[PDB]
């Protein structure tokens, strides 16, 4: 959009600073919980600062990176947007139910989403975007076939590419999708945003049908909602146990957060991890917990998408076999516990193991792939078919 000099990275800073000084207002009394402006802006600043150090003398090649150009433009537009939110909102900023106030919360979400995206692309401050690893592999294969190593694509370019595989049947449906997937609200789709959405909406094969069933037609789906908002909304239902809703989790993006009312009248919030949303919704209904979406007596039947095309089997190779024999065992077997065949694939890294060991590792407050220790963004169940 425009080239990034250090006068500009300067201008953003001054602007972020104003937005902070506004939000420090004693009359505002923002709740400290994610997303939280008084964390997000400083932390974004910190991270930017970190990227700048890394690019010293290389400022030429950083200024020319398209993702970064798009980020700094959106970041400026958004802060500016926030600053004039206050300006026009006047005192209506302090009425917690005020529309200005809800827009400010929408903005908190976005700032959060932007920082996560930024950390994703520049994890240590160094630009990884071209190497970014998409969690789900069918999703990965799509992006790579269509977009190469591009970190970011215009919305219309994304819409056209995707439509070729998963047909979007209309303009309205296209708008709904853009609004769901464009988390930073910049009219672009990052490889990062692609990751979040494909994780949220897996499996890839039924990704549009999935998204239709879980968001478009579903009374329980809440877009751009906050943990605190989810709590408030379910308050009206505290007397109807089984009432539930769900939303993107902001502190772990690409994971779902389900709020629900309990037999005794408490509002609790849970994250299914590694487990696809529908199964959770299906089990939760069957088991009595998730009953009346957003309070409604009618609960959708998701058994429709319960029948996914099965992931294939990996099929050990003559090469592999002879190797694992000279090692003394079978490739097929989980090299962690040593008593099981590998039933699960860690994503994005690809490493194979048994679910028991995966579960025990996670429950042990251990983190990331026990092998390469990269973060576990996804799991795909599998079966290995040995060479013999």
């Amino acid at each position: 959009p425009g080239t990034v000099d250090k006068k500009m990275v300067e201008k953003c800073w001054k602007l972020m600073d104003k937005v902070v000084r506004l939000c420090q207002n004693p009359k505002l009394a923002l709740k400290n919980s994610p997303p939280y402006i008084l964390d997000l802006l400083p932390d974004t600043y910190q991270h930017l600062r970190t990227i700048l150090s890394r690019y010293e003398g290389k400022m030429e090649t950083l200024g020319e990176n398209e993702y970064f150009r798009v980020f700094m433009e959106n970041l400026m537009k958004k802060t500016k947007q926030t600053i004039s939110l206050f300006k026009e909102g006047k005192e209506r900023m302090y009425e917690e139910n005020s529309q200005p106030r809800r827009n400010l919360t929408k903005l908190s979400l976005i700032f959060s989403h932007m920082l996560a995206e930024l950390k994703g692309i520049f994890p240590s401050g160094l630009f990884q975007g071209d190497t970014f690893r998409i969690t789900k592999a069918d999703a990965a294969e799509f992006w790579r076939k269509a977009f190469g190593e591009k970190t970011i694509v215009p919305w219309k370019s994304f819409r056209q590419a995707l439509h070729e595989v998963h047909p979007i049947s209309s303009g309205l449906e296209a708008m709904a999708l853009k609004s769901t997937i464009d988390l930073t609200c910049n009219d672009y789709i990052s490889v990062f945003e692609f990751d979040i959405f494909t994780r949220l909406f897996q499996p890839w094969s039924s990704l549009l049908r999935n998204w239709n069933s879980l968001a478009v037609t579903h009374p329980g789906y809440m877009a751009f909602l906050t943990y605190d908002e989810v709590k408030a909304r379910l308050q009206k239902f505290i007397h109807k146990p089984g009432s539930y809703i769900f939303r993107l989790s902001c502190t772990r993006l690409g994971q779902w957060a389900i709020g629900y009312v309990t037999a005794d009248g408490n509002i609790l919030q849970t994250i299914p991890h590694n487990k696809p949303l529908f199964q959770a919704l299906i089990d939760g209904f069957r088991e009595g917990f998730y009953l009346f979406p957003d309070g409604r007596n009618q609960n959708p039947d998701l058994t429709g998408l319960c029948e996914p095309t099965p992931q294939d089997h990996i099929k050990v190779t003559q090469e592999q076999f002879e190797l694992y024999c000279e090692m003394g065992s079978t490739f097929q077997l989980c090299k962690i516990c040593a008593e099981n065949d590998k039933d699960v694939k860690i994503e994005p890294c690809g490493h194979l193991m048994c679910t028991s060991c995966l579960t025990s590792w996670q429950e042990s407050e251990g983190q990331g792939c026990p092998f390469c220790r990269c973060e576990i963004k996804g799991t795909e169940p599998i079966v290995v078919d040995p060479f013999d």
């Binding site: 609790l268 959770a280 917990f289």
Partner: peptide
């Protein structure tokens, strides 16, 4: 202590 509890059983 992030606000999130374990899944209902």
């Amino acid at each position: 202590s992030d606000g999130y509890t374990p899944e209902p059983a």
